[PDB]
Structure 1
Amino acid sequence: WAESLIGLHLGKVALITGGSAGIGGQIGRLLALSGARVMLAARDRHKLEQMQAMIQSELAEVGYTDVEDRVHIAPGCDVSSEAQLADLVERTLSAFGTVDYLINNAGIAGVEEMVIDMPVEGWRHTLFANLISNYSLMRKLAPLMKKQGSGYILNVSSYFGGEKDAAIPYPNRADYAVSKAGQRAMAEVFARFLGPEIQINAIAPGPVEGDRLRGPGLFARRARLILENKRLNELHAALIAAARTDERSMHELVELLLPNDVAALEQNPAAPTALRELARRFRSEGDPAASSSSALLNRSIAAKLLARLHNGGYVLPADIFANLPNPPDPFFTRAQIDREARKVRDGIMGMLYLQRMPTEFDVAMATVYYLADRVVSGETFHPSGGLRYERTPTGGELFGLPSPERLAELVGSTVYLIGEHLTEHLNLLARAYLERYGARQVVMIVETETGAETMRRLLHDHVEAGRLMTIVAGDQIEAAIDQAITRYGRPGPVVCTPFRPLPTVPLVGRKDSDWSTVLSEAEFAELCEHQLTHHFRVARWIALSDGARLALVTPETTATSTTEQFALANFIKTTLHAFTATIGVESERTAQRILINQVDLTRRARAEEPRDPHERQQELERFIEAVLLVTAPLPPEADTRYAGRIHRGRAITV
């Protein structure tokens, strides 16, 4: 079977991250059988040595000599650490010289939580390990590839990273979905800069049979979260619903859960109907051996609940769940978790056209044959069948304005605008809301005092009339939104624009250059912070603000933007669609059920941009219409199952 591999990749040096197990282990193994010298990078030393030994043995059986020189290892390499990536490259270069193939395979599962329960640092950690690491390794190895006249960058993405012009929601996995989408987008936008010497593609496999999924594996962990998230979401919504029709504070309502007894809560006449009906449901649909049928929650679900309530603005002591009786193990039975795990597996098998999952060997084989193709760049290869998940087309240009009825509902509204560098857009938008649609007030949340002064001057008349308020956020956007809430009231429309413009630096260096001016690894992390994390932070906080309609706005491209700006802006556009689409679906699972959509100021081609002042004014009017379409209120009566998903997770191009 290995005879088709002999000489396929002979004379090539390949670097494989996550090379000690899974798909990466198989890629490294098959590249070695193909004639390549491979460097396998991962954290655990033993796992790497075991894999190195297995490959070296196979290579000897096949007929290779000096097998120790063909398979090297780089232990203690966590891809989320920049210093560890710099050490990887130095170790690889000293061992084999110039790297031909950079296989960006490592990809952590991530936080595995809904955005509202996702810590910001946990989201940053996923981006560092799965996305930023890919640029960092390319930045270090592409100068040597360009100098020798050839190279290959392969990013191992996923079916759940979506596609060109379509986003795929991945509920509970937004950080992961964004990182996968960014790996594909990197191949798409850097292709033109890296060519003709370097090829850059992505692989997007569908679900793969192996340790990651089988194990507690991804399926078993997803099963436990389904049951944990079900208990959390049901408690959260019922407490929010009770708060609307009850005189007691959230503190007093949460106190009713302290005996942590499902039966006692159901039988409590002093408890609101919403909480009593909830207790009825827990005992009625639960496993009697599971303590989750007799107890409302454990300290872990209690901590997730408290954090949601605190983020939502409810005043509760941090020690409210300190004396909470801990339920005896198991909270969820083996029977419950296994039933849920098999339902996850069956659902995936039913979606696959071939009704079978590939093995890691199957994916790696297809990838290794694909790597021999020298005439393709900027593409996403699908080595295995994808699912039947919802695809959200991104980039619709033909749209109108919402109905006059929806527009009339903006009269007396509270509008929040977030931004700084887009001064024209912010001034035009605040004026349309106050002058055309009779909004009561606009709260202009800027980054700096210089930004606050620029806006107060541009909007002087509305400032003096008390119609426009300014807040300086700095790097504390959540606390600034909390200041906006206490001081001016909860918002209706929320327009989130980036505080920073895109950088204007080269994306590749000249063949004989040191690449010293090229976008650094730190600058790429900064692009992600300002153009991705910025919106994630706002969306995470605004998702618990009842009645909000959030518009996530991407950077602006013009007829005079540099080619590098076009690349980075299109990289952002695509990566953010994954986030917008995922949180769009997650919103339906919460009691607030806010609207979240994306308005794109970025286009693919320079030719499509306005060229004269009339065309510029048309573009600026389209921006107002696009923002109004996603921020006008969708009446409760109209928010049906059908119309609800139409008004969430969409992206429109100005």
Structure 2
Amino acid sequence: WAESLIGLHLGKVALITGGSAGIGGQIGRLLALSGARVMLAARDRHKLEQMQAMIQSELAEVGYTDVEDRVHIAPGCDVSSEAQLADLVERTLSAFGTVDYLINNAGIAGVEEMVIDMPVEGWRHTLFANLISNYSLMRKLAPLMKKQGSGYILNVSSYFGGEKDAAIPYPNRADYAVSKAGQRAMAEVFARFLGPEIQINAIAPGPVEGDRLRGTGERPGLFARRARLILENKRLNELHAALIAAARTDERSMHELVELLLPNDVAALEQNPAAPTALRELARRFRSEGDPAASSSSALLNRSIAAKLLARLHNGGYVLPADIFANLPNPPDPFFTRAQIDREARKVRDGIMGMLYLQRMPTEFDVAMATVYYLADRNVSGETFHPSGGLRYERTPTGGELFGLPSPERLAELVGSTVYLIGEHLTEHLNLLARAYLERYGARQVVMIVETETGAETMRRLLHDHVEAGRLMTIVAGDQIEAAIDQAITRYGRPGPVVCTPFRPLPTVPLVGRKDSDWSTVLSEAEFAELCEHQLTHHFRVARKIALSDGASLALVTPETTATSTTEQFALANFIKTTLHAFTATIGVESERTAQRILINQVDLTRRARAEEPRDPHERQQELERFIEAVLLVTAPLPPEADTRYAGRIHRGRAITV
């Protein structure tokens, strides 16, 4: 089976992150069998030692000699740590000299929570381990590759990282999906810069067969554990959505509404004539869809679900005592029956197996083999190879440019509205949006949330008339956007429409260095992390907070490219646009599937090429008018009757290009 592999990569030096197990282990194994010297990097020394021993044994079996010199390991290497990545490169260059192939394989599953339950530090951790790490290793190794005249960077993405012009929603995995899309976007935008000496591509396998206790989750190993978590999550989502909906149209405070849940009695809530319709209707559903042997059919929640619900409400600025659930009656086991858990487990498994046209999942070996053959191809860069595929799954096309204004019915819903605008750099855009909502669409007030006092003063001067009239209020958020939103909620009221633009512009540093240079001025590992913080994490933090705070709509705006932008700015802008599309699509579907009203969409001020950009003042005025139209199209709320299943799916998770 190895006859076509032996010799294919003879003389090459490869570094494989996550090379002690899974797909990375198989890629390391097959590259070694192909004749490459390999450095396997991971955290656990024992597993690395086992993998090294197995590969060295197989190398000896096929005739290699001095096998100890062909397979090295780098234990203690957590790819989320910049220091460990620097040490990894020092160790690898000391052992083998210049690296020919960088296999950015390491990937963690991540937080595995919906965005509104996702800790901000957890999201950052996923980006560091799965995406920023890929740039860091490229930044350290590409200089030597360019000097020698040849190199290869392979980022191991996923089918769920999307594809060119199509986002793939991955509910409960936004952090992971964004990391995977960024890996592909990096290959797509860096190819022109790294050529002709260096190839950069991504692989995007679908679900792969592997250890049930490991993996990135495309294949769920423990379907039953996954099933129970889905059921606990569903109870939380149903209770949270009904409470948020009820509070929007009830005179009772969220505190008073949560008090209705304290008896923890489904039938009592359903039969309470003074209970909000949303909560009575939910109670009926719990009884109808429930298993009489499960306590979840007679009890609303348990301590675990209650704590997670309380966190959602507190994180949305709702005022409730921390001990509100201290005396919650504890429902008797089982809360969910083995029958309910087993049925959901079958649903999860059949859902995944049913995506496969070939009705079989590839093995890690199969994926590694296709990948090692692919690496021999010297005529591909900026591409995403699917070693496994044939999947029935939902895609959300991105990049549409032909659109108009929303219906007068949606526009009428803006009258008397409280609008939140977030930004700093795009002063003209923020001014025009504030005036549009206030002067043309009758919003009661606009809260301008900026990063700095200088930004606040700039906007206050641009909107002096509305400031003097009490219609434009300014808040300075700094690096505390959640606390700034809490200030807005308490003093000005919860938001209806929200527009989120980036505080910062894109950097203008080089993305690659001259062949015989030290690359001292090239985008740094820290600068790349900063780009992700200002252009991805910024939007995530706002989306998470606004969704938890019951905002009506949210437009995520990407950085602006102009006919004057640097070629590097165009590259970074397109990187952000593609990567954020993964976030927008994922949170749009999460929100739709969980009965959240919030409409989340993306408005792109970035374009693929300068030739498409406005070249004169007429074209510029056309562009700024399209920007306002695009924002209005995604932010004007749907008259509640129109939020059909059909229309609701259309108005969520989409991206349009101005």
Q: Scaled by the length of structure 1, what TM-score is found?
A: 0.95
Q: Flag the 1:266–1:412 CA change in 2: closer, same or farther, 3 A.
A: closer
> Which shifted more, 251-260 or 192-201?
251-260
Range 350-359 or range 587-596, more displaced: 587-596
Say yes or no: does 1:404 pair with 2:408: yes
**DSSP-derived class of the 1:529 partner:** helix
Counterpart residue number, 1:296: 300
Distance 1:252 1:462, change over 3 A: closer
What is the deviation of 1:334?
A: 4.6
- Is the Cα contact below 8 Å between 1:170 and 1:582 reproduced in 2? yes
Match of 1:391 among 382, 389, 395: 395
- Quote the offset at 1:427 in angstroms: 1.3
Displacement of 1:98 after TM fit?
A: 1.0
Mapped partners of 2:472, 2:249: distance in 1 = 33
Q: Which residue of 2 aligns with 1:240?
A: 244
Q: 1:430 to 1:11 in 2, by over 3 A?
A: same
Q: Residues 280 and 407 (structure 1 numbering): CA distance in 2 closer, same or farther, change over 3 Å? A: closer
CA distance in 2 between counterparts of 1:546 and 1:426 reads 22
Q: Could you say if the C-alpha distance between residues 463 and 245 of structure 1 is closer, same or farther in structure 2, counting changes exceeding 3 Å? A: closer
Task: Please name the residue that 2:206 is paired with.
Answer: 206
Answer whether contact 2:316 2:550 (CA < 8 A) is retained: no
Structure 2 CA distance, aligned partners of 1:489 and 1:262?
32
SS in 1 for 2:600: strand
Q: How much has 1:322 moved relative to structure 2?
A: 3.2
* Distance apart, 1:286 and its partner CA: 4.1
1:413 and 1:492 in contact (8 A); partners too: yes
| Deviation of the 1:325 alpha carbon | 4.9
Give 1:234 deviation, angstroms. Answer: 1.7
Kindly state the Cα deviation for residue 454 of structure 1 after the two structures are TM-superposed: 0.7
- Inter-CA distance 131–641: structure 2 relative to 1 (3 Å threshold): same
Partners of 2:316 and 2:549 within 8 A in 1: yes
Distance 1:65 1:332, change over 3 A: farther
> Residue in 2 aligned with 1:111?
111
Q: Is the 8 A contact 1:207 1:386 kept in 2?
A: no
How many Å apart are 1:438 and its aligned residue?
A: 2.8
SS of equivalent residue, structure 1 residue 4? coil
Following superposition of structure 1 onto structure 2, how do residues 278-297 of structure 1 map, counting pairs within 5 Å?
Answer: 278-279=282-283, 281-282=285-286, 285-287=289-291, 290-293=294-297, 295-297=299-301
- 2:346 is the counterpart of 1:349: no
- Contact 2:317/2:489 (CA < 8 Å) preserved in 1? no
Q: Which moved more, 1:287-296 or 1:441-450?
A: 287-296
Which 10-residue stretch deviates more, 571-580 or 621-630? 621-630
CA distance in 2, matches of 1:603, 1:642: 30
SS in 1 for 2:642: coil
Q: Kindly tell me: are residues 461 and 477 of structure 1, through their superposed partners in 2, closer, same or farther at Cα, counting changes over 3 Å?
A: same
Q: Structure 1 CA distance, aligned partners of 2:102 and 2:192?
A: 18
Q: Could you tell me how far apart the structure 2 residues matched to 1:274 and 1:167 are? A: 33
- Asked whether the 8 Å contact 1:417–1:426 carries over to 2, the reply is yes
In structure 2, relative to structure 1, the CA distance for the partners of 1:110 and 1:420 (3 Å cut) is same
**Displacement of 1:256 after TM fit?**
4.1
- Alignment partners' CA distance in 2, 1:46 and 1:331: 40
Q: Deviations over 1:435-476 (max 9, x none)?
A: 222322221111000001111111112212222111111111
- 1:382 counterpart = 2:416: no
Is 1:205–1:386's contact at 8 Å kept on the other side of the alignment?
Answer: no
Go from structure 1 to structure 2 and tell me whether the alpha carbon gap of 1:336 and 1:210 turns closer, same or farther (over 3 Å shift).
farther
**In structure 1, distance between residues paired with 2:210 and 2:10:** 28
Query: Retained in 1: the 8 A contact 2:592–2:652?
Result: no
Deviates more, 1:368-377 or 1:273-282: 273-282
- 8 Å contact from structure 1 (residues 22, 212) kept in 2: no
Tell me how far apart the structure 2 counterparts of residues 99 and 324 of structure 1 sit (CA, whole Å): 59
CA contact (8 A) 1:159 1:386 kept: no
Q: State whether structure 2 residue 140 is matched by structure 1 residue 140.
A: yes
Decide whether aligned partners of structure 1 residues 398 and 248 sit closer, same or farther in structure 2, where only a CA change above 3 A counts.
Answer: closer
Tell me whether 191-200 or 334-343 shows the greater mean CA deviation: 334-343
- The verdict on how the C-alpha distance between 1:323 and 1:386 changes in structure 2, with shifts beyond 3 A counting, is farther
In the alignment of these two chains, the number of paired residues is: 653
What is the alpha-carbon distance in structure 2 between the residues aligned to residue 476 and residue 316 of structure 1? Answer: 22
Give the aligned partner of residue 434 of structure 2: 430
Moved more, 159-168 or 66-75: 66-75
Q: Secondary structure at the match of 1:32?
A: helix
Q: Deviations over 1:262-286 (max 9, x none)?
A: 5666677886665455445445544
- Aligned-pair distance for 1:570? 0.1
CA contact (8 A) 2:100 2:145 kept: yes
Q: Deviation per CA, 1:547-585, whole angstroms, max 9, x where unpaired?
A: 521111000001111111000000000000000011111
Aligned-partner Cα distance in 1 for 2:259–2:495: 29
2:559 is the alignment partner of 1:555: yes
Q: CA deviation at 1:107?
A: 0.9
* CA 345–311 in structure 1, closer or farther in 2 if over 3 Å, else same: same
Q: What is the CA distance between 1:354 and its match in structure 2?
A: 1.1
Q: Is the 8 A contact 1:547 1:592 kept in 2?
A: no
Q: 1:335 to 1:74 in 2, by over 3 A?
A: farther
Give me the whole-angstrom Cα distance separating, in 1, the residues matched to 2:547 and 2:637.
15
Relative distance call for 1:394 and 1:102 in structure 2 (3 A) is same
> Alpha carbons of 1:267 and 1:491: their partners in 2 closer, same or farther (altered >3 Å)?
closer
- Structure 1 pair 25–642 and aligned structure 2 pair: CA distance change class (3 A): same
Q: What SS does the aligned partner of 1:351 have?
A: coil
Structure 2 match to 1:451: 455
CA contact (8 A) 1:211 1:217 kept: yes
Q: Is the 8 A contact 2:511 2:523 kept in 1?
A: yes
Tell me the alpha carbon deviations over residues 157-177 of structure 1, each in whole angstroms, 9 at most, x when there is no partner: 011001101111111111111
Q: Quick one: structure 1 residues 331 and 98, their matched pair in 2 at CA, closer, same or farther if it must change by over 3 Å?
A: farther
CA contact (8 A) 1:213 1:219 kept: no
1:409 is displaced (CA, Å) by: 3.5
Selected match of 1:420 from 419, 424, 432: 424
Alpha carbons 1:544, 1:592 under 8 Å: kept: no
Cα pair distance change 1:447/1:364, threshold 3 Å: same
Question: 1:57-83 deviations in whole A, cap 9, x for unaligned?
Answer: 111111111111111111111111111
User: Any stretches of 5+ residues in structure 1 without a counterpart?
Assistant: none
Kindly provide the CA deviation profile for residues 418-448 of structure 1, in whole angstroms up to 9, marking residues without a partner as x: 1001111111221222222232222111100
Change (3 A) 1:268 1:412: closer
- 1:37-69 Cα offsets, whole Å, 9 max, x none, are 111111111111111111111111111111111
Distance in 1 separating the partners of 2:188 and 2:100 = 20
Range 407-416 or range 223-232, more displaced: 407-416
2:498/2:551 contact within 8 Å kept: no
Q: CA deviation at 1:333?
A: 4.6
Query: Is the contact made by 1:585 and 1:649 (CA closer than 8 Å) also made in structure 2?
Result: yes
Distance 1:272 1:603, change over 3 A: closer
CA RMSD of aligned residues (A): 2.1
**Cα pair 1:132 1:524 within 8 Å, conserved:** yes
Secondary structure of the 1:155 match is strand
Report the CA distance shift for 1:517/1:362 in structure 2 as closer, same or farther (over 3 A).
same
| Separation of aligned partners in 2, 1:437 and 1:255 | 38
Deviation (angstroms), 1:332: 3.8
- Shift of the 489–255 alpha-carbon distance from structure 1 to 2, 3 Å rule, reads closer
Residues 378-387 or 232-241, more deviating: 232-241
Task: Confirm or deny: 8 A CA contact 2:358 2:390 kept in the other structure.
Answer: no
Q: Do 2:409 and 2:639's aligned partners in 1 also have CA atoms closer than 8 Å? A: no
- Whether contact under 8 Å (2:167, 2:396) holds in the other structure is yes
- Check the 8 A contact 1:233/1:589 in 2, yes or no: no
- Bigger Cα displacement from structure 2, 121-130 vs 260-269: 260-269
Residue ranges of structure 2 left out of the alignment (5+ in a row): 215-219
Cα offset, 1:651, TM superposition:
0.6
Instruction: Label 1:192 to 1:644 Cα distance change in 2 as closer, same or farther (>3 A).
Output: same
Look up the match of 1:462: 466
CA gap 1:195/1:46 in 2 versus in 1, 3 angstroms: same
Q: CA deviation at 1:587?
A: 1.4
Contact 1:20–1:42 (8 Å) recurs in 2: yes
Residues 86-126 of structure 1: CA deviation (Å, up to 9, x unaligned): 11111111111111111111111111111111111111111
Give the 3 Å change call, closer, same or farther, for CA 396–467 of structure 1 in structure 2. same
**Contact 1:402/1:632 (<8 A) preserved:** yes
Compute the displacement of 1:32 (Å). Answer: 0.7
Shift of 1:241: 4.5
Contact 1:490 1:545 in 2 (8 A): yes
Q: Say which is worse superposed, 552-561 or 261-270, in terms of deviation.
A: 261-270
Give % identity. 100
Deviates more, 1:399-408 or 1:628-637: 399-408
Q: Which moved more, 1:287-296 or 1:308-317?
A: 287-296
